[PDB]
Amino acid sequence: NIDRPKGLAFTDVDVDSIKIAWESPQGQVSRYRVTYSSPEDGIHELFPAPDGEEDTAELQGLRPGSEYTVSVVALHDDMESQPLIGTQSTAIPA
């Protein structure tokens, strides 16, 4: 069974490139539904089926430089573990 994650972290965030890393749900997930929404462009669905060694994501190819509302959700055959939110500020072009 899954175990639900807790809090995610961020490595390198940029108006056009952000690296995030969430905590594994101590249950080895088979798929991860990472969605990110924004008050302008809209939202998108990411399907980077992880394996166990890659507990992070690479949002490379954005544009805006504001707070992006991302939601990391672990998966397992067909479950909906607590949706982990990740509100980060896309480092504008300073």
PDB file of C-alpha atoms in Angstrom:
ATOM      1  CA  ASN A   1       0.000   0.000   0.000  1.00  0.00           C
ATOM      2  CA  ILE A   2       1.148   3.621  -0.485  1.00  0.00           C
ATOM      3  CA  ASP A   3       2.306   5.754   2.489  1.00  0.00           C
ATOM      4  CA  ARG A   4       1.622   9.367   1.397  1.00  0.00           C
ATOM      5  CA  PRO A   5       4.508  11.820   1.101  1.00  0.00           C
ATOM      6  CA  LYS A   6       5.197  14.727   3.496  1.00  0.00           C
ATOM      7  CA  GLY A   7       7.031  17.821   2.180  1.00  0.00           C
ATOM      8  CA  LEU A   8       8.886  18.436  -1.103  1.00  0.00           C
ATOM      9  CA  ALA A   9      12.033  20.547  -1.652  1.00  0.00           C
ATOM     10  CA  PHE A  10      13.546  22.621  -4.488  1.00  0.00           C
ATOM     11  CA  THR A  11      17.045  22.495  -6.026  1.00  0.00           C
ATOM     12  CA  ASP A  12      17.396  25.118  -8.785  1.00  0.00           C
ATOM     13  CA  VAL A  13      14.366  27.274  -9.693  1.00  0.00           C
ATOM     14  CA  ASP A  14      14.421  29.720 -12.626  1.00  0.00           C
ATOM     15  CA  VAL A  15      11.851  31.672 -14.664  1.00  0.00           C
ATOM     16  CA  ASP A  16      12.556  29.077 -17.391  1.00  0.00           C
ATOM     17  CA  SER A  17      13.896  26.017 -15.504  1.00  0.00           C
ATOM     18  CA  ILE A  18      13.120  24.537 -12.071  1.00  0.00           C
ATOM     19  CA  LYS A  19      14.304  21.380 -10.277  1.00  0.00           C
ATOM     20  CA  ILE A  20      12.137  19.922  -7.488  1.00  0.00           C
ATOM     21  CA  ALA A  21      12.536  16.887  -5.200  1.00  0.00           C
ATOM     22  CA  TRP A  22       9.700  15.365  -3.127  1.00  0.00           C
ATOM     23  CA  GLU A  23       9.916  12.757  -0.340  1.00  0.00           C
ATOM     24  CA  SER A  24       9.255   9.130  -1.329  1.00  0.00           C
ATOM     25  CA  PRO A  25       6.114   7.674   0.221  1.00  0.00           C
ATOM     26  CA  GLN A  26       8.141   4.870   1.861  1.00  0.00           C
ATOM     27  CA  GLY A  27       6.147   2.554  -0.433  1.00  0.00           C
ATOM     28  CA  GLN A  28       8.121   2.581  -3.714  1.00  0.00           C
ATOM     29  CA  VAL A  29       5.586   4.177  -6.100  1.00  0.00           C
ATOM     30  CA  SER A  30       5.127   2.899  -9.675  1.00  0.00           C
ATOM     31  CA  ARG A  31       3.973   6.222 -11.176  1.00  0.00           C
ATOM     32  CA  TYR A  32       3.855   9.911 -10.184  1.00  0.00           C
ATOM     33  CA  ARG A  33       1.179  12.386 -11.334  1.00  0.00           C
ATOM     34  CA  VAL A  34       2.849  15.826 -11.204  1.00  0.00           C
ATOM     35  CA  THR A  35       0.562  18.664 -12.341  1.00  0.00           C
ATOM     36  CA  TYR A  36       1.402  22.401 -12.350  1.00  0.00           C
ATOM     37  CA  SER A  37      -1.109  25.246 -12.792  1.00  0.00           C
ATOM     38  CA  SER A  38      -0.666  29.012 -13.277  1.00  0.00           C
ATOM     39  CA  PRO A  39      -2.962  32.042 -13.261  1.00  0.00           C
ATOM     40  CA  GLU A  40      -2.436  32.648 -17.005  1.00  0.00           C
ATOM     41  CA  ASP A  41      -1.004  29.749 -19.059  1.00  0.00           C
ATOM     42  CA  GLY A  42      -3.157  27.118 -17.318  1.00  0.00           C
ATOM     43  CA  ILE A  43      -2.182  23.691 -15.937  1.00  0.00           C
ATOM     44  CA  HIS A  44      -0.430  20.617 -17.397  1.00  0.00           C
ATOM     45  CA  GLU A  45      -0.088  16.914 -16.471  1.00  0.00           C
ATOM     46  CA  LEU A  46       3.353  15.288 -16.059  1.00  0.00           C
ATOM     47  CA  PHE A  47       3.840  11.479 -16.197  1.00  0.00           C
ATOM     48  CA  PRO A  48       7.470  10.759 -15.324  1.00  0.00           C
ATOM     49  CA  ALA A  49       7.054   7.161 -14.117  1.00  0.00           C
ATOM     50  CA  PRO A  50       9.887   7.107 -11.568  1.00  0.00           C
ATOM     51  CA  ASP A  51      11.602   3.917 -10.331  1.00  0.00           C
ATOM     52  CA  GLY A  52      12.927   4.641  -6.816  1.00  0.00           C
ATOM     53  CA  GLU A  53      16.285   6.387  -7.344  1.00  0.00           C
ATOM     54  CA  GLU A  54      14.809   9.477  -9.044  1.00  0.00           C
ATOM     55  CA  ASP A  55      12.629  11.244  -6.450  1.00  0.00           C
ATOM     56  CA  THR A  56      12.758  14.646  -8.212  1.00  0.00           C
ATOM     57  CA  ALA A  57      11.539  16.315 -11.442  1.00  0.00           C
ATOM     58  CA  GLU A  58      12.948  18.688 -14.094  1.00  0.00           C
ATOM     59  CA  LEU A  59      10.473  21.390 -15.184  1.00  0.00           C
ATOM     60  CA  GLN A  60      12.666  22.662 -18.013  1.00  0.00           C
ATOM     61  CA  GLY A  61      10.800  24.773 -20.600  1.00  0.00           C
ATOM     62  CA  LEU A  62       8.598  27.352 -18.824  1.00  0.00           C
ATOM     63  CA  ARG A  63       8.410  31.132 -19.476  1.00  0.00           C
ATOM     64  CA  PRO A  64       6.762  33.129 -16.684  1.00  0.00           C
ATOM     65  CA  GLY A  65       8.624  34.179 -13.513  1.00  0.00           C
ATOM     66  CA  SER A  66       5.950  33.914 -10.794  1.00  0.00           C
ATOM     67  CA  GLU A  67       4.647  31.459  -8.163  1.00  0.00           C
ATOM     68  CA  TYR A  68       3.793  28.228 -10.010  1.00  0.00           C
ATOM     69  CA  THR A  69       1.244  26.046  -8.179  1.00  0.00           C
ATOM     70  CA  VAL A  70       2.583  22.513  -8.716  1.00  0.00           C
ATOM     71  CA  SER A  71       0.986  19.367  -7.264  1.00  0.00           C
ATOM     72  CA  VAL A  72       3.051  16.181  -6.811  1.00  0.00           C
ATOM     73  CA  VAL A  73       0.895  13.063  -6.348  1.00  0.00           C
ATOM     74  CA  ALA A  74       2.293   9.541  -5.912  1.00  0.00           C
ATOM     75  CA  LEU A  75       0.437   6.625  -7.546  1.00  0.00           C
ATOM     76  CA  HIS A  76      -0.065   2.856  -7.230  1.00  0.00           C
ATOM     77  CA  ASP A  77      -2.155   0.849  -9.764  1.00  0.00           C
ATOM     78  CA  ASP A  78      -5.107   3.210  -9.098  1.00  0.00           C
ATOM     79  CA  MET A  79      -4.900   5.298  -5.894  1.00  0.00           C
ATOM     80  CA  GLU A  80      -5.008   9.011  -4.965  1.00  0.00           C
ATOM     81  CA  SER A  81      -2.559   9.566  -2.077  1.00  0.00           C
ATOM     82  CA  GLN A  82      -2.618  13.017  -0.436  1.00  0.00           C
ATOM     83  CA  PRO A  83      -1.797  15.493  -3.191  1.00  0.00           C
ATOM     84  CA  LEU A  84       1.510  17.188  -2.278  1.00  0.00           C
ATOM     85  CA  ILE A  85       1.412  20.878  -3.277  1.00  0.00           C
ATOM     86  CA  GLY A  86       4.574  22.748  -4.313  1.00  0.00           C
ATOM     87  CA  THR A  87       4.107  26.527  -4.626  1.00  0.00           C
ATOM     88  CA  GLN A  88       7.480  27.879  -5.817  1.00  0.00           C
ATOM     89  CA  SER A  89       8.348  31.278  -7.340  1.00  0.00           C
ATOM     90  CA  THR A  90       9.788  30.885 -10.856  1.00  0.00           C
ATOM     91  CA  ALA A  91      12.976  32.999 -10.532  1.00  0.00           C
ATOM     92  CA  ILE A  92      12.210  35.884 -12.880  1.00  0.00           C
ATOM     93  CA  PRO A  93      14.958  37.060 -15.235  1.00  0.00           C
ATOM     94  CA  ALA A  94      16.932  39.190 -12.731  1.00  0.00           C
TER      95      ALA A  94
END
